[PDB]
Design a protein around this ligand. Structure first.
Ligand code: CHL
Ligand code: CLA
Ligand code: CLA
Ligand code: CLA
Ligand code: CLA
Ligand code: CLA
Ligand code: CLA
Ligand SMILES: CC(/C=C/C=C(C)/C=C/[C@@]12O[C@]1(C)C[C@@H](O)CC2(C)C)=C\C=C\C=C(C)\C=C\C=C(C)\C=C\[C@@]12O[C@]1(C)C[C@@H](O)CC2(C)C
Ligand SMILES: CC(/C=C/C=C(C)/C=C/[C@@]12O[C@]1(C)C[C@@H](O)CC2(C)C)=C\C=C\C=C(C)\C=C\C=C(C)\C=C\[C@@]12O[C@]1(C)C[C@@H](O)CC2(C)C
Ligand SMILES: CCCCCCCCCCCCO[C@H]1O[C@H](CO)[C@@H](O[C@H]2O[C@H](CO)[C@@H](O)[C@H](O)[C@H]2O)[C@H](O)[C@H]1O
Ligand SMILES: CCCCCCCCCCCCO[C@H]1O[C@H](CO)[C@@H](O[C@H]2O[C@H](CO)[C@@H](O)[C@H](O)[C@H]2O)[C@H](O)[C@H]1O
Lengths: 165, 194, 212, 217
């Protein structure tokens, strides 16, 4: 398929890998009773193992000669062949959360700079203010862009201290 | 002012009284700006004159039995020889486009540099009907009203043909035969239901 | 703020001030305050007349034709339910008749609207300029040729009240035709005969409970 | 002072006279997206275009849907109409979309330049004499002129009322489309068919029992 890979659902090594893991679990099972606590736990593990291998094959991943899933990172190859969920979609999932956390913290830091004693508002958090800013961060991409266009996102070069040069 | 398009309504201020064909009809105020009105006044007459020739040509072809306005140019795509009053014409599609483009470009180019003359006269008025100032006023009104009627009539030909797929004279005869059976309501397209 | 002298839909009830008896049939009924805005109430005043006047014609056109059929009077359209007249075959197809209907109504309705927008501006015959309506007519009440018998020259206020009372009742009747026809499945006069046959056991409570 | 939530503190930026001039202002801005006055002016235009586009689209899904059920028309489900139309079509969907982007892009571009410089499209000579009617009105997002053939915007008394109706039906239409998308995945049926199912047995056919919305239950 892509880069010589093959779908895991059609991979011989991938299928053999599942048997090896289940065989290991089964070997430990036969030293217990039918419905003892250890036996129930082992059976639960085997169910998750079978579900995991079905899900990855159902997801249409690609397996190498090693018979293990490999991920596609190029946006063009991902959208071309329906691998957007491996890296491409999670890329924009993380950035939204990462910007959320960073934007909320920046809003709080600006908020307390106006207070009389900003330092005491950092070791001792103003929880009522933090919760207020936590909820308003859901729209950070909109607020972040509007700050950039209005020119209030960055400090002026003349207001930033620098070393002699 | 020629009249009133909507009795009981006020006339737009920006439309001059002496402008021929003035019925005070400008719901969208497209001619409010004097610069825009000057261009549109010329374009209405030019459209009217072309439509009047177009409608006359469309009716003449079918009345004389040489076909309908729609299928006249089919010989080019189908593959054949042009005809005019039944006599063969040697030119082909490529030749016609070249000569038409050159002739129209030269004639229309001359008018373009005039600056917006709608009533040139002189060389274009050999019989001198509109030489007298007083007489010209009413003739201009007659020209535009027939021109406006021709513009609507041609729109009827195109719209009716799309619905019924027939020529204008053929449709007129069909309506006369069965007035209540053949009309826009009964063509199955103009009215969505029924 | 409405005075207590005027008739009230609910005696001893406070009523809106803007319903001050000017309009015919002004009984102060407006629990939802729809007509509070004078501009809107100006429109609703004409809508009531238009819906009412058509309703009076429609109800008359649904009972009288059926009444004649029972009496035995014979005409080609006899015995056709009011909701089956559309399916009936006439000299021309329904589509062609519909097209003519809109073209004819477009002229008169726009003529009527022009007067409403600017009263007195549509009182002249476009062709025969000699003809004209009286200049004192108000929106919704053309008069003139529309009142050939001069009834409007009498107690106009009472006549306006009588018109709206009959009109409002007519509008309710037509809604009864749709509800009854959709439920009973028969013509209106048939429902009346059933009710008169056994008034006590033929109420809508009896009829609808049986169905579900 | 009507508000989306009585007893809540309306955002300050929505209480300014400029903000209160906007139709449908009920003080709803919990995330503070409109704090910057320049941003709110841009977001108001976005709502109007979303409102008007949604109303046209929903009307194109609902009215054909009802008439189809009534038997007066035969139109496929809104989520299938794209495939059905392209079959008996004069062009493939690639060519059809490319033209759509040129025409929409050109028209949208002119609207864009009016937001940046209101009334700037009436530049003399810019269009073939038609620029005079492209100046718009004194209110951004309400062009008028050729876009108001019946002149319903010339009545001052009814002006505020008209704008409120547009925004209210527009917001309702936007939610309707979001319901069509969610109900297609949830139920796998048409919008009108979903309504028919709910009316038959309201207490057993709803999102609480569709087996998707509430996975825990
Ligand atoms: C006040 C307005 C008004 C009202 C309330 C009705 C109400 C009705 N019309 Mg009527 N019409 C009205 C005005 C008009 N109608 C018609 C022409 C027709 C026709 C031709 C038919 C009706 C029929 C119907 C019924 C539709 C329900 C039904 O049985 O569907 C089920 C429909 C059918 C079983 C008919 C199937 C065959 C039909 C040829 C298919 C095409 C029907 C059209 C789409 C109907 C369009 C009607 C619209 C314009 C109001 C219902 C009783 C139908 C009827 O009487 O059914 C018993 C019918 O066939 N109307 C015209 C044109 C002159 C009107 C003009 O204003
Ligand atoms: C980090 C850098 C990087 C690199 C090395 C590649 C590499 C590749 N990309 Mg990817 N791509 C990237 C980033 C990158 N991409 C980004 C950031 C995007 C936008 C989110 C895309 C969007 C994209 C698309 C839409 C497509 C590719 C494709 C490709 C392949 C051939 C064309 C190409 O991009 O040539 C070298 C790369 C560059 C010079 C960098 C810019 C690449 C642009 C954005 C895409 C060029 C597409 C090309 C015109 C397609 C022509 C048809 C093709 C079959 C020959 C190649 C494996 C094509 C593919 O699937 O081929 C099988 C394809 O269709 N890429
Ligand atoms: C806008 C004007 C206009 C245009 C563009 C056309 C175009 C056409 N006409 Mg039509 N026609 C028009 C007006 C027009 N007509 C008018 C006003 C009349 C009434 C007199 C006619 C009468 C008419 C007939 C009777 C026929 C056409 C036909 C044609 C076709 C061939 C024309 C040709 O080869 O001429 C070639 C002409 C010349 C070489 C001579 C040029 C004019 C001389 C100098 C006039 C001298 C006086 C073509 C589709 C023919 C058709 O339909 O064929 C299928 C056809 O049979 N037209
Ligand atoms: C709202 C007013 C209204 C409307 C829309 C209709 C519509 C109709 N009437 Mg009704 N009718 C009305 C009022 C109305 N009527 C009134 C006030 C009366 C007096 C009691 C009648 C008496 C009446 C009779 C006696 C008959 C109809 C019939 C008809 C049908 C044919 C009409 C026709 O071609 O007339 C002829 C055209 C002109 C006079 C022009 C049609 C469905 C006929 C029908 O349903 O036949 C099956 C029919 O027999 N109407
Ligand atoms: C109960 C019914 C009723 C009544 C009392 C009135 C009363 C009035 N109408 Mg109105 N009108 C009605 C129904 C009615 N109208 C309907 C249904 C229509 C629609 C066609 C109209 C259309 C109309 C117009 C266009 C005009 C009036 C006008 C008038 C005024 C003068 C005429 C008059 O007194 O007629 C009294 C009416 C009757 C005694 C009705 C008797 C029954 C008749 C003959 C019909 C029988 C049908 C048959 C049973 C089938 C007056 C306020 C005029 C006005 O306001 O002038 C200033 C005016 O211009 N009416
Ligand atoms: C103009 C008013 C009017 C009149 C005189 C009638 C008369 C009749 N209706 Mg109808 N009906 C009307 C309006 C009217 N209806 C409306 C508006 C609807 C829609 C909701 C219906 C829906 C309806 C159904 C579903 C049924 C009837 C039925 C009946 C019958 C009486 C038994 C019953 O269940 O009544 C129920 C009706 C009502 C409670 C009417 C309430 C609304 C009106 C406007 C009240 C008016 C009161 C006022 C004092 C005037 C009284 C009449 C007046 C002439 C003195 C009888 C033939 C039944 C039938 O056909 O039995 C064989 C039947 O099944 N009607
Ligand atoms: C955002 C608005 C929008 C969009 C994008 C679509 C998109 C679509 N509609 Mg829908 N539609 C809409 C609004 C919209 N509609 C509205 C508001 C209505 C009225 C309630 C309809 C009623 C409607 C019907 C009845 C049908 C569609 C169909 C279609 C398809 C295109 C048909 C075609 O090839 O037309 C090409 C032609 C044009 C774009 C030019 C316009 C031609 C019309 C006839 C002009 C009417 C002028 C009017 C009378 C004044 C497509 C899925 C058809 C479908 O689903 O087919 C499978 C179909 O049957 N639509
Ligand atoms: C309908 C039309 C224009 C209509 C315009 C309208 C209603 C405008 C209305 C308003 O703007 C106002 C005034 C004021 C605003 O406030 C309001 C609106 C409402 C916006 C023009 C037709 C214009 C029509 C024209 C110019 C037709 C020309 C036809 C020709 C040359 C035909 C030639 C041939 O037919 C032959 C002879 C033989 C065939 O074989 C070959 C061919 C080539 C087909
Ligand atoms: C434009 C739109 C829909 C357009 C639909 C179209 C063209 C459909 C077209 C067609 O269907 C037809 C006709 C026929 C089909 O055969 C084909 C297609 C092509 C499918 C929907 C928008 C839909 C838009 C929606 C639902 C937007 C919702 C936004 C919300 C709720 C925002 C809320 C807040 O932002 C506020 C206001 C303030 C903040 O402080 C707080 C939060 C909470 C963040
Ligand atoms: C769709 C066609 C694409 C191909 C290119 C088209 C080019 C069209 C050029 C038209 C030029 C018209 O020019 C003419 O009218 C203009 C407008 O009144 C005048 O200005 C010019 O002095 C005059 O010569
Ligand atoms: C079209 C215009 C918009 C919609 C108008 C709605 C108001 C009129 C509703 C009429 O409702 C109507 O439905 C059925 C026809 O469809 C009628 O049904 C009846 O007529 C049938 C013929 O058509 C016959 O087989 C039976 O007598 C019965 O089924 C109902 O007895 C009547 O209530």
């Amino acid at each position: 398929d892509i880069a010589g890979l093959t779908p895991c659902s059609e991979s011989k090594a991938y299928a053999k890998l599942e048997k090896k893991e289940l065989k290991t679990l089964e070997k430990r099972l036969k030293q217990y009773e039918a419905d003892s606590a250890p036996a129930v736990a082992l059976k639960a593990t085997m169910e998750r193992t079978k579900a995991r291998f079905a899900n990855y094959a159902k997801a249409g991943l690609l397996c190498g000669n090693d018979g293990l899933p490999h991920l596609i990172a190029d946006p063009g190859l991902a959208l071309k062949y329906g691998h957007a969920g491996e890296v491409f979609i999670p890329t924009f999932g993380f950035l939204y959360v990462a910007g959320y956390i960073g934007y909320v913290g920046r809003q709080y830091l600006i908020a307390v700079k106006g207070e009389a004693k900003p330092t005491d508002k950092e070791i001792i958090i103003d929880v009522p203010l933090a919760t207020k800013l936590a909820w308003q961060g859901a729209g950070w991409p909109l607020a972040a862009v509007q700050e950039l266009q209005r020119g209030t996102l960055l400090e002026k070069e003349e207001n930033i201290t620098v070393s002699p040069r | 002012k020629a009249g009133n398009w909507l009795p009981g309504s006020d006339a737009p201020a920006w439309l001059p009284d002496d402008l021929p064909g003035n019925y005070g009809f400008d719901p969208l105020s497209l001619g409010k700006e004097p610069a825009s009105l000057k261009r549109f006044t010329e374009s209405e007459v030019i459209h009217g004159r072309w439509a009047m020739l177009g409608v006359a040509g469309s009716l003449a072809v079918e009345l004389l039995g040489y076909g309908n306005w729609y299928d006249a140019p089919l010989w080019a795509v189908n593959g054949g020889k042009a005809t005019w009053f039944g006599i063969e014409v040697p030119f082909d599609l490529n030749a016609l486009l070249a000569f038409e483009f050159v002739a129209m470009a030269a004639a229309e180019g001359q008018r373009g540099d005039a600056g917006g003359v709608v009533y040139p006269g002189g060389a274009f008025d050999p019989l001198g009907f509109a030489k007298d100032s007083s007489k010209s006023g009413e003739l201009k009104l007659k020209e535009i009203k027939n021109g406006r009627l021709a513009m609507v009539a041609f729109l009827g030909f195109v719209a009716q043909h799309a619905a019924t797929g027939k020529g204008p004279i053929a449709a007129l005869g069909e309506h006369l035969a069965n007035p209540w059976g053949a009309n826009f309501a009964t063509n199955g397209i103009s009215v969505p239901f029924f | 703020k409405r005075d207590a002298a005027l008739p009230s839909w609910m005696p001893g009830a406070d009523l809106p001030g803007y319903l001050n008896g000017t309009l015919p049939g002004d009984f102060g009924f407006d629990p939802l305050y729809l007509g509070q805005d004078p501009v809107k109430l100006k429109w609703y005043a004409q809508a009531e007349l238009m819906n009412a006047r058509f309703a009076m014609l429609a109800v008359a056109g649904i009972l009288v034709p059926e009444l004649l059929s029972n009496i035995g009077f014979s005409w080609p359209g006899a015995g056709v339910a009011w909701y089956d007249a559309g399916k009936f075959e006439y000299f021309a197809p329904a589509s062609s008749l519909f097209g003519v209907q809109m073209l004819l109504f477009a002229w008169v309705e726009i003529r009527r609207y022009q007067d409403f927008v600017k009263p007195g501006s549509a009182n002249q015959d476009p062709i025969f300029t000699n003809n004209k309506l009286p200049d004192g007519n108000e929106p919704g009440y053309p008069g003139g040729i529309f009142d050939p018998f001069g009834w409007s020259k009498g107690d106009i206020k009472s006549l306006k009240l009588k018109e709206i009372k009959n009109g409002r009742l007519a509008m309710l009747a037509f809604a009864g035709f749709i509800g009854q026809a959709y439920t009973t499945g028969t013509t209106p006069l048939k429902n009346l005969s059933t009710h008169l046959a056994d008034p006590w056991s033929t109420t809508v409570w009896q009829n609808d409970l049986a169905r579900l | 002072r009507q508000s989306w939530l009585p007893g809540s503190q309306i955002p300050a930026h929505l209480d300014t006279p400029a903000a209160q001039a906007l139709a449908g202002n009920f003080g709803f801005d919990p995330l503070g997206l409109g704090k910057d006055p320049v941003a709110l002016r841009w977001y108001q235009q976005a709502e109007l275009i979303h409102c008007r586009t949604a109303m046209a689209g929903v009307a194109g899904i609902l009215i054909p849907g009802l008439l189809t059920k009534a038997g007066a028309l035969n139109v496929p489900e809104w989520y299938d109409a794209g495939k059905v139309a392209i079959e008996n079509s004069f062009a493939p969907w690639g060519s059809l979309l490319a033209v759509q982007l040129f025409l929409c892009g050109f028209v949208e571009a002119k609207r864009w330049q009016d937001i940046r410089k209101p009334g700037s499209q009436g530049e003399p000579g810019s269009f073939l004499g038609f620029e005079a009617s492209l100046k718009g009105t004194s209110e951004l997002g309400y062009p008028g002129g050729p876009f108001d053939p019946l002149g319903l915007s010339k009545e001052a008394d009814k002006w505020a009322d008209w704008k409120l109706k547009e925004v209210k039906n527009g917001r309702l239409a936007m939610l309707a489309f979001l319901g069509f998308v969610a109900q297609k995945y949830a139920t796998g049926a048409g919008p009108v068919d979903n309504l028919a199912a709910h009316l038959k047995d309201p207490w057993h056919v709803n999102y609480a029992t569709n087996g998707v919305s509430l996975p825990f239950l």
